[PDB]
Design a protein around this ligand. Sequence first.
Ligand SMILES: CC1CCN(Cc2c[nH]c3ccccc23)CC1
Ligand SMILES: CC1CCN(Cc2c[nH]c3ccccc23)CC1
Ligand SMILES: [Cl-]
Ligand SMILES: [Cl-]
Ligand SMILES: [Cl-]
Lengths: 697, 695
Amino acid sequence: DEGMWLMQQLGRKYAQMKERGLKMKEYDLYNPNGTSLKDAVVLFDGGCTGEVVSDRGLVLTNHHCGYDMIQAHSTLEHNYLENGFWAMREADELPNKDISVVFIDKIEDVTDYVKKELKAIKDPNSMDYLSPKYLQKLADKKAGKNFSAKNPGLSVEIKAFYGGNLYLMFTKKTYTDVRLVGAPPSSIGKFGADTDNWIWPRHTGDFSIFRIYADKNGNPAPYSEDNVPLKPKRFFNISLGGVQENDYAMIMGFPGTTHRYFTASEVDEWKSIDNDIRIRMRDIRQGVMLREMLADPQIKIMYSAKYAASQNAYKRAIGANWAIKTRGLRQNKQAMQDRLIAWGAKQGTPRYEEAVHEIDATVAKRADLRRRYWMIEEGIIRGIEFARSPIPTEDETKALQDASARKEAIDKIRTRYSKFANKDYSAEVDKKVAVAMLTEYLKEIPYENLPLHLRLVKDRFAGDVQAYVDDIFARSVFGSEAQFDAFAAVPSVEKLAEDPMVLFASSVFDEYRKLYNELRPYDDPILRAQRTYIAGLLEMDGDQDQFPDANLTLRFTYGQVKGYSPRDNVYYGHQTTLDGVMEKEDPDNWEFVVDPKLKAVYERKDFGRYADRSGRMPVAFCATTHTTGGNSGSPVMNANGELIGLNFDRNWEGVGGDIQYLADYQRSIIVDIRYVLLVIDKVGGCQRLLDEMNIVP
Amino acid sequence: EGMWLMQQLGRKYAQMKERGLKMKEYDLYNPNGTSLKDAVVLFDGGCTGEVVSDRGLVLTNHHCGYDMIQAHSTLEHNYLENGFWAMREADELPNKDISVVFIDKIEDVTDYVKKELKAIKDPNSMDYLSPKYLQKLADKKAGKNFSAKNPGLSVEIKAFYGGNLYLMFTKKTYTDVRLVGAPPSSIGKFGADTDNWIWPRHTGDFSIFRIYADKNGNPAPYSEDNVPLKPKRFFNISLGGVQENDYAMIMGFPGTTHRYFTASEVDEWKSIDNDIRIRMRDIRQGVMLREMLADPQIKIMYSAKYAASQNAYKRAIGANWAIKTRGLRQNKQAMQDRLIAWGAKQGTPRYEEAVHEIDATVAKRADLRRRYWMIEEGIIRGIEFARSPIPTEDETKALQASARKEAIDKIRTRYSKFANKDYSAEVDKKVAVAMLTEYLKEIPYENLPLHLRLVKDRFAGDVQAYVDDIFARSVFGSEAQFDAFAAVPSVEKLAEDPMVLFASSVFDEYRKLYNELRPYDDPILRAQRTYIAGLLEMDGDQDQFPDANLTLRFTYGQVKGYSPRDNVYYGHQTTLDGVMEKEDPDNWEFVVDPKLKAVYERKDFGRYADRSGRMPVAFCATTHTTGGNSGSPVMNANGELIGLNFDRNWEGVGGDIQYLADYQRSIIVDIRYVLLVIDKVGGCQRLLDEMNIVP
Ligand SMILES: CC1CCN(Cc2c[nH]c3ccccc23)CC1
Ligand SMILES: CC1CCN(Cc2c[nH]c3ccccc23)CC1
Ligand SMILES: [Cl-]
Ligand SMILES: [Cl-]
Ligand SMILES: [Cl-]
């Protein structure tokens, strides 16, 4: 609804944005033929968003965006992840291998060009109109002969939008020398740890600082000691004016994916198959893991990360199913498609109703296969660790059935066994997880649809799941270290070909691949019908109040700084403060430890020019902007285009926003720039970073 | 902020009028005439209730009438789960051992008691607080045969302000109080125990009774000839509802507070009482929860025991949060230092001496009090086999006349009660192993109950082995072990039984600690009499109320929500929409009554919904309440009934030591929601018709 607009759509949205509080001139925010604020936005490390905040190429992004770089530069002597990092001179900024920042130099509507090229149709059902290989061939053709060589640092890309009804060509400028400049300690950068993920109120200072480096002429260059900071076309001014309830706020970033044009049948499928299976299977897996972690402190250490990784999409699916149940998402897709069908009937064009029918019939046809795919993926592929135990290759088997190739094959198998049964793997915890997961899977998947090895539960073990799992470990070469070593001393192909763990792993991966192959053909009639469906929606109501689905491209969104009521008699305001961090402090809980330097700043009220009018220290705020994954680190702007914060999350009540924007619940969770500037100053003591920024009072 | 005496209404009236009170002083409390005070009752010796009709109809909480509803419930007519609605007065169910107490008169007898106390002789006598001594003074003042000359009336004298003020209450008690109506448990106890101490709250916590009496309105025990009581005063029910900032007031019987604690008593309450209860109950509850989640039959057997342990655990967490965050210790320290500075200026050192005595007694009893709380929380309430059977002297002098079979039957009856349908020996062994491991880490060998010395001496520190041996060798370790004993019972076997020796040993230590600690209460009580007298002489009895002591008090405030934490606000009112948001069909605690769900869907709210068409459920207020205030009437600026108090938020449990203006709230069921349930759920229109409802 309130969307993720293309840069091209700024002209037709400008009057609405000005009516809502925007004060800056249109072309100062985005101009296709000149420097604008869009030039200060980057795609950071291929997923996150970032922003240039100085004339020396300083870049701000989230702490979770720069986490890998902070961890790669951390040692037991200098633990930057735990204590933070603050380069006191430019020469101290740490280079990062395999990093990139992408500027969106130009954006061009190439729809007529692509549609003309597509007319050279050999097959009307061809999926080349969505093919990245085909679209790249069109981009190179339009850009010219050896474009990347004639314009170093530049590259061109064509993307489909609106289901193949609009195409844009992006000219990108990529920098690969991007150095670590500063980061708060993890106690600030990830304060709520996984407890506060998807949660508002939020008290996390989710930021990290980098710097773009380039050759002497500002042109992209890989890491070199001779590289100099980039002087950019444009950078953001930092506002110290803060935010008030109802203030206009806007964001630019790279949202990843949305499903705004789902039919009501696709919403039902998402709920009843995807979400219900993920919820059910992860609840079983997590329940067993938690019981084992709570009983043995060593199991808690080994399984804490695996448990946290399972919980993230579990929480997302709970949040998504809450919107489907309470916000009428299915009903609103049903009303949208019925309105298009009625309009098509009145215009004498039945192709829109035919397209919606095709989608519904494909969804109904693939239901059993999709249910079987999600059951095996959630239940076994992800659910059971020994499903990813070693499977001897075609060549490895041959190199065991008269040369030194046997010791080579055994070394490869040993390396894979040592990765599977690593320092964090408990065979006992895995057997208990497998028994509960397989019991549920065997109740849901009939005998005829089981992976072949799982048929032994009924046929060989009289339905005893525990005995079938016990037998896998008791007899397998990968059941324990002593069992592997006995095999490694006298390795026979006959033993491997009949190994219960190998047969289980092979069998479950066989079924998983077979289901994937049988389901893949159903995606194409839905995609082709969506091209017709979205064309109808656009022709009927226009490209004014319906944005194209996110597809990892540059978008803007606007709204207001505003809280919301999550439930009866409860209101969450628009801004959190440093007092809220102190309320959450728990010294004996690593997730909620408070940095001593930050605690003393709060006690002393050493907030300087960063506190609000009442003398309170702001931490984070929330806004009615429409964001999703891909918007981590996005710049949040004032009515004047000044930086007021960095987006870092969205509340669980707004996960349904990827299908239907929720005005009364969905909020972007943003770290206040005043809190960013307080941490750099009072916790990092890195004054040179403050001095190079253009700070407006 | 206070729990004011009825006598203090005159001195508080102007402040209440400034806060919104519209009714005349003597219409609320008149010391020599009829007033709103006359419609308030002490319900069943703990709760509060209120008369709401000229035919003696009484409203109180659902938790207050819970026992009566359960006693009248059968598998055929389960009134506890389905609710109960007597469609005629003759259908109202009598209750054995029930009472309602009216506070007929209240009189200041301080000078009388103080004159009588001059005859003591021993300056450190505790007769000034003795209920037996005070009752002797009450009978003397009322007259030789007062109850015969005034049937249904009795008198009682109570101490206030640590023995610096005495009031005599003239009570009128009715013992025929019948069950009239109750919502289903899904409404009366909606959160079940999940929402206990919680605001926002969506519980319709109410139940309905009726006072019966003889033909002349005089108290009478249950009789078929009893007729409903025509009271001299009853509350009018308001349908005007509440708005944010509205004046609200309550009358009730708050049980206890500790407003005059020294800073050292606040430290002791935190570091001994609360920390031990929190630590021991977290261990006990953790083991119980693991076992209940793994076996559905264990969940059935242990759900009630687990819930009973959790209630005071949550109270202690809430209390420790106030001590840590609201500066409770610091505010008691400032109060005592202000009195000490004032006493130094006046030339009277007795106040500073009284505070020093309290601190020294607290410091002196620290180790004993820690040992007492450790054994009480850790073993007496923590381990079920601590309450296993102990053969009496009479039972032992029977096993070694042949009433050996009668002695075995008494021991068997106690064994069958201990090892009942809800007892799991396996669950108890696991709880005991974790509880004893903690207890043995905290209590040194020399301070252990004698039998627990065997963990180190006989079992090489193996707690599991010591507990396994108790069950493997005890006559109460299993049914087969008891029966083998019962067939051939010998005193030699009982006197050496590991479970009997454990149970006797832990109860011996528990009693010894209690006996050694009891003498420390007296110097603190005597010093508090001097301390409170100083505080009253220094700042007056105007902004400092006497501690609650189960007597009639009033409190006033406003209908107002609060901010529990940064960027979160809880408003002043909950709605029926919040009940529907919490509905969980496969969770017995959050099931929603189909009749109530239908009323909400069809918006069949009648004259009970607010101006916006939303159905109110509960509200909260800045009144100062505590345990004993369950079922208290909540009044308008005009004295009309707007709700019934039923709880207080966990953030306000610290309010028993220091009232918390920004956090503490009384949790009240909206009277409009009470009437909606009687009408649309119970269909008991005759109850609505007998009430005086004001638009
Ligand atoms: C505040 C939330 C914390 C979790 N995070 C997922 C995530 C973990 N690591 C990342 C690196 C880059 C992009 C996303 C992620 C989303 C935001
Ligand atoms: C909302 C309630 C508040 C008090 N209650 C304790 C209790 C349980 N039963 C009772 C009967 C009379 C008086 C108090 C109680 C627990 C929940
Ligand atoms: Cl057509
Ligand atoms: Cl909404
Ligand atoms: Cl009366």
